[PDB]
Write a protein that binds this ligand. Sequence first.
Ligand SMILES: O=c1ccn([C@@H]2O[C@H](COP(=O)(O)OP(=O)(O)O)[C@@H](O)[C@H]2O)c(=O)[nH]1
Ligand SMILES: O=c1ccn([C@@H]2O[C@H](COP(=O)(O)OP(=O)(O)O)[C@@H](O)[C@H]2O)c(=O)[nH]1
Ligand SMILES: O=c1ccn([C@@H]2O[C@H](COP(=O)(O)OP(=O)(O)O)[C@@H](O)[C@H]2O)c(=O)[nH]1
Ligand SMILES: O=c1ccn([C@@H]2O[C@H](COP(=O)(O)OP(=O)(O)O)[C@@H](O)[C@H]2O)c(=O)[nH]1
Ligand SMILES: O=P(O)(O)OC[C@H]1O[C@H](O)[C@H](O)[C@@H](O)[C@@H]1O
Ligand SMILES: O=P(O)(O)OC[C@H]1O[C@H](O)[C@H](O)[C@@H](O)[C@@H]1O
Ligand SMILES: O=P(O)(O)OC[C@H]1O[C@H](O)[C@H](O)[C@@H](O)[C@@H]1O
Ligand SMILES: O=P(O)(O)OC[C@H]1O[C@H](O)[C@H](O)[C@@H](O)[C@@H]1O
Lengths: 456, 455, 455, 456
Amino acid sequence: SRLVVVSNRIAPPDEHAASAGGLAVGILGALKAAGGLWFGWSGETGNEDQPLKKVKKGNITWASFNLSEQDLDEYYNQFSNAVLWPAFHYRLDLVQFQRPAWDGYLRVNALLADKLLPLLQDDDIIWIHDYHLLPFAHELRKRGVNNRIGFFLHIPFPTPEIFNALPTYDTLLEQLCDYDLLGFQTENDRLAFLDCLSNLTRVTTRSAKSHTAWGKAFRTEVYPIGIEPKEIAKQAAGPLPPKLAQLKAELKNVQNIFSVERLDYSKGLPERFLAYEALLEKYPQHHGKIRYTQIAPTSRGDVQAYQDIRHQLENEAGRINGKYGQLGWTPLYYLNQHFDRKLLMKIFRYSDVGLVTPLRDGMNLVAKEYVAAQDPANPGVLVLSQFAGAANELTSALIVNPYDRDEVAAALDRALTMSLAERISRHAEMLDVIVKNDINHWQECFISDLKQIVPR
Amino acid sequence: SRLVVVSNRIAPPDEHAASAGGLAVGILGALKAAGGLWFGWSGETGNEDQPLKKVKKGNITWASFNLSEQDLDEYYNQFSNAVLWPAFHYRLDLVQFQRPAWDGYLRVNALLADKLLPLLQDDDIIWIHDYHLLPFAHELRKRGVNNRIGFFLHIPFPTPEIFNALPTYDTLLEQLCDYDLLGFQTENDRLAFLDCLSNLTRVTTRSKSHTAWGKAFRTEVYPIGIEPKEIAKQAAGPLPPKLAQLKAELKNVQNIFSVERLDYSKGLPERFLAYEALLEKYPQHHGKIRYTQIAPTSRGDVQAYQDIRHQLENEAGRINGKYGQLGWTPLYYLNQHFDRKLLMKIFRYSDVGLVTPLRDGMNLVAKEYVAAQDPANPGVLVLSQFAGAANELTSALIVNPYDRDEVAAALDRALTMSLAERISRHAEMLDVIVKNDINHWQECFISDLKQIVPR
Amino acid sequence: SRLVVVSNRIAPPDEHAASAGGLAVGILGALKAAGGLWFGWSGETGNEDQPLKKVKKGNITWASFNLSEQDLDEYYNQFSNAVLWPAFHYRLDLVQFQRPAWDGYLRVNALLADKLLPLLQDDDIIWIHDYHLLPFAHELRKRGVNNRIGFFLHIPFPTPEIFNALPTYDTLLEQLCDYDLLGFQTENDRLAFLDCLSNLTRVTTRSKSHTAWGKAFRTEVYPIGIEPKEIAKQAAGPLPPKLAQLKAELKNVQNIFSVERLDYSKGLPERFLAYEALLEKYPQHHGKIRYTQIAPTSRGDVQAYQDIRHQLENEAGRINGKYGQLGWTPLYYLNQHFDRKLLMKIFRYSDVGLVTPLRDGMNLVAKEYVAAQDPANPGVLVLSQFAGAANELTSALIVNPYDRDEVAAALDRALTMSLAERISRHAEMLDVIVKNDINHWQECFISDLKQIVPR
Amino acid sequence: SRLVVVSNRIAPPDEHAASAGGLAVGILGALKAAGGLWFGWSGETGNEDQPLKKVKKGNITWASFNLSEQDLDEYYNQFSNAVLWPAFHYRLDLVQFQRPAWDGYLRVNALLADKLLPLLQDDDIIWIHDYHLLPFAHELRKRGVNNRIGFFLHIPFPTPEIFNALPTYDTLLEQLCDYDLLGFQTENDRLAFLDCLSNLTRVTTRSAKSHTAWGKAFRTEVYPIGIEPKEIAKQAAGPLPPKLAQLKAELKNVQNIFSVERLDYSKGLPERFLAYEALLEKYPQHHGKIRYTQIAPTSRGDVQAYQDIRHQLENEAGRINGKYGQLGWTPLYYLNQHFDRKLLMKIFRYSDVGLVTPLRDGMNLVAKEYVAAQDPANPGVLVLSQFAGAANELTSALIVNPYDRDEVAAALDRALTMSLAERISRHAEMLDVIVKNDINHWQECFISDLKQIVPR
Ligand SMILES: O=c1ccn([C@@H]2O[C@H](COP(=O)(O)OP(=O)(O)O)[C@@H](O)[C@H]2O)c(=O)[nH]1
Ligand SMILES: O=c1ccn([C@@H]2O[C@H](COP(=O)(O)OP(=O)(O)O)[C@@H](O)[C@H]2O)c(=O)[nH]1
Ligand SMILES: O=c1ccn([C@@H]2O[C@H](COP(=O)(O)OP(=O)(O)O)[C@@H](O)[C@H]2O)c(=O)[nH]1
Ligand SMILES: O=c1ccn([C@@H]2O[C@H](COP(=O)(O)OP(=O)(O)O)[C@@H](O)[C@H]2O)c(=O)[nH]1
Ligand SMILES: O=P(O)(O)OC[C@H]1O[C@H](O)[C@H](O)[C@@H](O)[C@@H]1O
Ligand SMILES: O=P(O)(O)OC[C@H]1O[C@H](O)[C@H](O)[C@@H](O)[C@@H]1O
Ligand SMILES: O=P(O)(O)OC[C@H]1O[C@H](O)[C@H](O)[C@@H](O)[C@@H]1O
Ligand SMILES: O=P(O)(O)OC[C@H]1O[C@H](O)[C@H](O)[C@@H](O)[C@@H]1O
């Protein structure tokens, strides 16, 4: 009956205290449709031995814990953010594996399982989310929890040649098979996991997507995470804040290219800046008549790799504006700031081009949000990296390879001069795909698949 | 009779082929008033054995030479730009002394003296400019030239504690004393040179008239200036159509404006930091002000210049990233050269001129800013105390750039200053620069030179 | 009949003009066994329109060309070294794709095919080597060459998820299928290529024998080897007098020794960090062990190579700074090239060979280390699981370089390993490499090639 | 009667808990000769409201305080270490002036004066040390202390053109004139101060070194800080630790160039490394036959400028050894470690060449220790920067300009090949100068000069 969701990041009930990130947006979407309990990190450190904080808002209940400084450091900043995140994004050169980080990662997964245990009922359907919690089912099983437990990976699962470089890949794979159901964003993610598993041990697969390894039974499946198209429509059509109501009037003959994401090296922001520079170099007709705005709030700012990409991005903004700016025209607006999601939906609506070219991305909700926010009668154009999970479904976007800056520049140019009729038909095709594959659909398919398996 | 001017940099007769830099602006100004021969580097490398190139335009004659790649490198990029420039600007940490650069520096001074020699007449009054040519009089003397030779240093002369770190300070000082007249931008520069000299040898001063090692020479101060009438004219000319638009659109935005070569002497990072402090501590200005910084690349082959440029690009991206809004860029950084004609107009329409070098011989941009202003509604000059110009632009808002909050506070005072206090500050500064004309500079120097008896 | 080998890099006939790199060592090994014509770049730039340079030494003929500055830059430094090398080593973050480099890469492959054409006979068997020449068969096909052409890739072939990021992966795959035979270093490389191919087009495999776009071709694995008999000879020769000394002085110090091009594929910083962990967690080894790293600069014009080198310099200074003593330097980092002959001898006197690349097609240094050991008292090989050699050197201490403590622990195990366990580990490794001779490599590849019927 | 010494840094009574630095070595030397009370920072942070810690050892009494994290940061790391230290060492490019640092600097001087007040007697002769405490006399005066107060500046006093860049030079000068006696390390330092003062206000000087400014009377004088030549002789001749007894035997045909200092940018370590490289480049005869050992413990490692210089030095050690090393010869031994002073005396004795080439240095005791420790019958050679205060008296050292690496290399070469007779006579001249100007002489001259002025 009752759904129990666990993730590291939560969306707070005070909704504009939100931090950038697709997982929390997704899960809140799901929970609002389902009902249930959300157990996860409050986002604060210190006071770890205080009782769980609990808030109820309609059909959702939140239970949060704090983490000690050391746990946050070893489990979150080191293992999750400087081993798993880079490795799953094919950045082995950025992995920073050390044994104490691994031990802390295991230590907090165990701790969190101790803290969740008293909240659970026999009934519960338990849904664990994302790379912070790979060991979590295994920790619940050793505490005797026999409930259905499903896992969903929000980020890519990398091929063996990358995954097996993890010193501890070994244990990770064993422990993932303690889940009853493993959900992935794309077929390639699922197949990659199954590949890694097969390299280590014999996996029997006697039915579509139903497996045995080390005598443990489990199911795999693909559920591309979505968005609430109706709600973003509503928020995108609400009035603009006064200061932006001005800027819209002033920029009446300027076209807007707009991008928004956490400042993460997975997102290819320097390559993007370079593609914009190539646009300005090779298509001088756009000078003074277009504007690229990049919103990039700091994310995980304690991890060295994140500091480096941020400094690199500041350099490129200064450089590009330094070179192509005029007294009365800044080509590139870089904002290292967090914007309310409500507001972003409006900004999307008034952008002529959404630029979403991550080097590697499990899904990318910004891409779907961009489409859902457009005025169907006069929609902008989506330029999308082929490496974003969303490219499997947003097939009518201008699909590009971000490693080819000139291909991205050309797609920006095509997007800026695209006729209304082509923009209508590209948009309506994309909108239909994301309406059919609702966050409500995601949630439904996963829970239904989970409820369908018999527990051990 | 005939004046012979020599400098490394020249102002070409094709006038919009001009490169940023105050020396060439100054000397052209001077020569236009005097008449004369300008001998110097064409700005090109290769073909060094070709005849001098000569062009005559009115009362001025240009004679230029090319330099080899190696000479340019040793004399210009290394010794002049990576030893003398940083040392004279109190940046010993940036000096890059190596013996081959010193040898090349002497080698080209000698070469240039050979090339100049056949052009000279007994008559000539010879006026050598700037740190590239410290040894030049010495080179001319060993070739038997007995003419009056004056030198003018366009940049600061540093105190002994800095100057004496130069491995070769020694020879530099000996050789400076072969000039009949040494001119400096401020009294402190003159006194600093005299100090350095006194530390090395006994200097008799029986009158600014000296003896060292039995060589007689005179010292004097001539702060370089501007043509206030001509900039008035160019500042009042119509704006290019694109800028005529921007002025209309920025009707309720105040403009803080700065322009200079991208040089570490100019304290651009500290400036950016002062602007950040303005934005941090005076939030009332958000959306209502704009700081535009124009900084063309200078001497871009010298590592220290690359470093400062990268650092400035970082700060622009950082500051805009932190204080920018969807419809408001706090800081416009342009790494581009602008025509001087156009700058005069931009000055006129700026509410505040921000000129806060860490160290500067004079700084003509400060004087240009005041000369350009509409007397009836002038902007405010915020000026570093370390710019030579601060000795005379005493009515500017004088600040210490090492204190970003003092600079922010002066920016705020400048932005809210009444019309009356703008009128009276401006009319005092304008008078000082009108009285001390580039024409006055040129006249005082030549007159002082013509007044000494040659050896 | 006649074998024609083409590679970018060649081993010169003056043998101590040799540059570090396994390809040239391999191919020379092969050619010495076979006989044949070696066509490739001389290593020099300029004079590109001069005739091919030809030298004959025994059963080998060399024919070399020069490259222009621009071709070297686009084809070698940019496309080969800053796109293909980093991508095939799973370093997409380092790829520096630009269209002019791609065009230059095509242009030089085409040019080289024009230059090779007149040397070819109908007879020939053509063997093309490495990532510089992926388009070469395609170029030869359009010039009408119907000969058997085999290709051998000396480096890894990356999985689709990486390979498909190449903007041009497309064309590369098409063109590789113009080879009759594609050879790889490990089964995984072969499978990865086949995967990439299958993602793009339908591949029929009715037998390692394939069809794509109606083109027939074969794939196979030939791990490249060494001459074990020759190194045994060169390892046992007398030491240079200076090193004869050091061996006497270091009698109670154990030597960990590593040698490779200073390449980011080799994981040198991670290696230094593993050594640091050894020194941190096993203090009993202080003053009693020594880690020497030899790392000649390779491809020093490519930014990513400069970066890794600067990082390595920093770590050497830091580690020595922290663990050194007045009479003990823990870590000897030498950014210098050593003659191969001499390296064999050093290997023989090292107690541990440390070979932990992050990613490596094969790694001959690992095989040379085993071949050089005195069978009666051999050192221990510590080997990254990511080196192709790990598929066969199964009895080395196999480690994951991303886990510095696993590497430190294996160094500790290696330093204290009993004679008996060193004898049996070494003999097992030596046998593998003796059965899989460079001669065997060459034989298998030629024999497979000679076995296909040409178009 | 009773002498009261105050400095930020103290030499602890547990003597091998000592931190590198000449001030504490000097003052302890002085106090051991005099007798007295030493009031200063314990070196610890936190517990700032605890009573002064007091220890008595013979004729010396220590009274120490802790500082809060914020006070340490503003007064010590920011103002003292990132404004005054760089400015007084002619590194305006490194000054990091901010008003909160200035306020904290004043705040702690005031606080320390409150803490000292109850310990003072009418009698006391008060001796304040170094740039941390420029305002201290002023603080004592406003609390009504009329005692003789002397100040001694251990570092250079920079010329007006540098000093006047300090936003706050103003107040600093006013407040220095509240001291009865101002002591400097060299005549140039004294003259520089007097210059700065003269630029601001009229100073009357009616006698040898006796002044009036703003109606405040005060005296100036020069007291070059020294060393205990007899004691270092003793410690230098003591047996070597067994490990070093070995190395000396093994290095019998290798000559040793040796340097030791805090890793500070004032010391010109990178320039030194470059001079060593030039020696190796231009004098290949020395390859395999010499060794340069640099000892450089981290100092003030929280200050960005110190981190920068350290990283730079690590790079140069790696680079130079990479380039000139051989399988059996490391040209350069860089050790980022603290060595006991006792041991250093011995390592000086056994060094052929002491390389002391700071870019700028108040005095430099390492230079004097280097000469005091040599075996008079077979002494090494001192190579000395002209910018070290010591160069005014160690006139027989090989004096060099560190900005000319080839001049420094040449001096190293001359030092390595100098005949015994020249080495004797250069050493005996230097030794006599430092014997005559004893730490005991320093202490005596200062106290005697102080005792000679009549208090207000
Ligand atoms: O300043 C921002 C930046 C991002 N987002 C939201 O954060 C989520 C980003 O999720 P996405 O899948 O694009 O990327 P992720 O952060 O999860 O990698 C989206 O819902 C964005 O609207 C936001 O609310 N404010
Ligand atoms: O983009 C630019 C930058 C500056 N200048 C001119 O360069 C000179 C700057 O001289 P100043 O003495 O201010 O500084 P310097 O450049 O010689 O150190 C002034 O006349 C400017 O008007 C210019 O014409 N365009
Ligand atoms: O200073 C050196 C360093 C390397 N090598 C040789 O160069 C080849 C290195 O080849 P390997 O396959 O290990 O690495 P690669 O350089 O091809 O990536 C081996 O023969 C080494 O012995 C050498 O001769 N001198
Ligand atoms: O590792 C070290 C190096 C330095 N010293 C001593 O610390 C003092 C440094 O004083 P100096 O005046 O030479 O430099 P300072 O820190 O005072 O500016 C000298 O006595 C050195 O012998 C020390 O105790 N340990
Ligand atoms: O939670 P943060 O580290 O701040 O990152 C924000 C979110 O980024 C991605 O969406 C991850 O898939 C989520 O697990 C994460 O929460
Ligand atoms: O000539 P550059 O090196 O470009 O620098 C431009 C000018 O900068 C300063 O104004 C110097 O005083 C001049 O001598 C120099 O000519
Ligand atoms: O030839 P270089 O670019 O110096 O690199 C040396 C060699 O390194 C590796 O072995 C490559 O596989 C070879 O193709 C290359 O020839
Ligand atoms: O105490 P630190 O800040 O580490 O510096 C070490 C010591 O040596 C220097 O010479 C200073 O003059 C002293 O005041 C200082 O206390």
